[PDB]
């Protein structure tokens, strides 16, 4: 009873990139998701229980997952190459510590929930393949997805370990002093620790649990303060004006490009959208590389129904196609008049004109010139 | 005695030796003051404490977690809690950790090239 020389020996504490790899890794974390889901399902069940080979119908799917993990284990043997680094690999160590213990438990025909949840490290794999599945082909978004994946991975692993230590008890005290709480309760406590609020309504009764969570919360605060400074700003540095223009039938629009600055656009809007006009029914769009300033978004918001903004270059025919100047009535060019060399703006406006006319040679162009 | 001199030794000196020394001496200090009891009240409230729960009480006291499981049950013990907060929280806020955050990670490409024969 309470055997450990077989579970630890199974843990092995001593020590005939392409689609082929993609399919196997997808299967790996899909079965990891399924096994973690069924672990959450049967977490309410006690750790130790009897189980025959043809008794638990739910555990048959777990045995299919287990033999598939054995196939992945043989794959790890195949791809080991250097045996030293092969057992030095952390994921390989996790597999060593989770799958052969399952094999030994099934051979003993008894249920043991100890370190069964350790597959949560593999939950970070789908972040890389989401780029392949063209849901998110950028870099900042996939970095954020990977970071939240490792966050939730260490979340579930720590929650499981605190839960097992909590419901286990002190082995030298006949493990009869263990408290009773569920996985949701240990999740709540580990928010209590990580958030540093410290409610203290319900705590870790086990002394070894406290002596674990002490340096665990040291490491957790270290990693939190290390990683949040590259988490918070991700919601800020996201492109907003990268979309195209949706034309409205029966209503014309014009395109304003070139050097646009706060005072220039303020003057242009104030003498173009003047109230003493018979009828203004044209949308004004802007093209520029440098992102607009907060006052410029303020002007755009106060003229939300008349002016729209997009980011791009007049030298990019893809950007001109995005702006859809084919149906535009006319195009306007604003020229900077304060820089040192006047000929530079003249040449720049010449390039703007030739690009616009090359893309469409039958539109109206009005431009400044120094 | 021939330590690994790659600034890891000096970061060890300036962070972890002093951290462990202060933490352990504070744990022993609270253990003594709590097991002693109240002097003028004839030591009636001498709470029985072990060193594990003492150092756990220190680490709960520092950082921010306000666990109500264990606390100081005596006036001079609460005095010493206040002094330990005023010292350790200020230290852990502005003196020690910034060194370990400016340590960061190790070198990225400090390795060498293995000349594989035949190529």
From Swiss-Prot, chain A:
Binding site for Mg(2+): 283, 306, 308
Lineage: superkingdom: Eukaryota
RCK N-terminal domain span: 251-370
Effect on the protein of changing residue 224 to A: Loss of function
Stated consequence of mutating residue 116 to E: Induces reduction in the coupling between calcium and channel opening
Record text on subunit structure and interactions: Homotetramer; which constitutes the calcium-activated potassium channel. Interacts with RAB11B. Interacts with beta subunits KCNMB1, KCNMB2, KCNMB3 and KCNMB4. Interacts with gamma subunits LRRC26, LRRC38, LRRC52 and LRRC55. Beta and gamma subunits are accessory, and modulate its activity.
Miscellaneous note of the record: The protein was initially thought to contain two functionally distinct parts: The core channel (from the N-terminus to the S9 segment) that mediates the channel activity, and the cytoplasmic tail (from the S9 segment to the C-terminus) that mediates the calcium sensing. The situation is however more complex, since the core channel also contains binding sites for Ca(2+) and Mg(2+).
Family indicated by similarity: Belongs to the potassium channel family. Calcium-activated (TC 1.A.1.3) subfamily. KCa1.1/KCNMA1 sub-subfamily.
Protein's UniProt name: Calcium-activated potassium channel subunit alpha-1
Covered residues, full protein: 84 to 526 of 1236
Curated annotation (Swiss-Prot), chain B:
Tissue: Widely expressed. Except in myocytes, it is almost ubiquitously expressed.
Effect of residue 64 to S: Activated at more negative voltages. Slower rate of inactivation. Impaired inhibition by HMIMP. No effect on channel inhibition by Iberiotoxin
Transmembrane segments: 13-33, 80-100
Motif Selectivity for potassium: positions: 64-67
Residues of the full protein shown: 289 to 407 of 1236
This protein's domain notes: The S0 segment is essential for the modulation by the accessory beta subunits KCNMB1, KCNMB2, KCNMB3 and KCNMB4. The S4 segment, which is characterized by a series of positively charged amino acids at every third position, is part of the voltage-sensor.
Disulfide bonds: none
Described function: Potassium channel activated by both membrane depolarization or increase in cytosolic Ca(2+) that mediates export of K(+). It is also activated by the concentration of cytosolic Mg(2+). Its activation dampens the excitatory events that elevate the cytosolic Ca(2+) concentration and/or depolarize the cell membrane. It therefore contributes to repolarization of the membrane potential.
Source superkingdom: Eukaryota
Record field: intramembrane: 48-70
Outcome recorded upon mutating residue 92 to A: Loss of function
Family per similarity comment: Belongs to the potassium channel family. Calcium-activated (TC 1.A.1.3) subfamily. KCa1.1/KCNMA1 sub-subfamily.
Note: The protein was initially thought to contain two functionally distinct parts: The core channel (from the N-terminus to the S9 segment) that mediates the channel activity, and the cytoplasmic tail (from the S9 segment to the C-terminus) that mediates the calcium sensing. The situation is however more complex, since the core channel also contains binding sites for Ca(2+) and Mg(2+).
Protein name: Calcium-activated potassium channel subunit alpha-1
Quaternary structure and partners: Homotetramer; which constitutes the calcium-activated potassium channel. Interacts with RAB11B. Interacts with beta subunits KCNMB1, KCNMB2, KCNMB3 and KCNMB4. Interacts with gamma subunits LRRC26, LRRC38, LRRC52 and LRRC55. Beta and gamma subunits are accessory, and modulate its activity.
Locations listed in the record: Cell membrane
Cytoplasmic side: 1-12
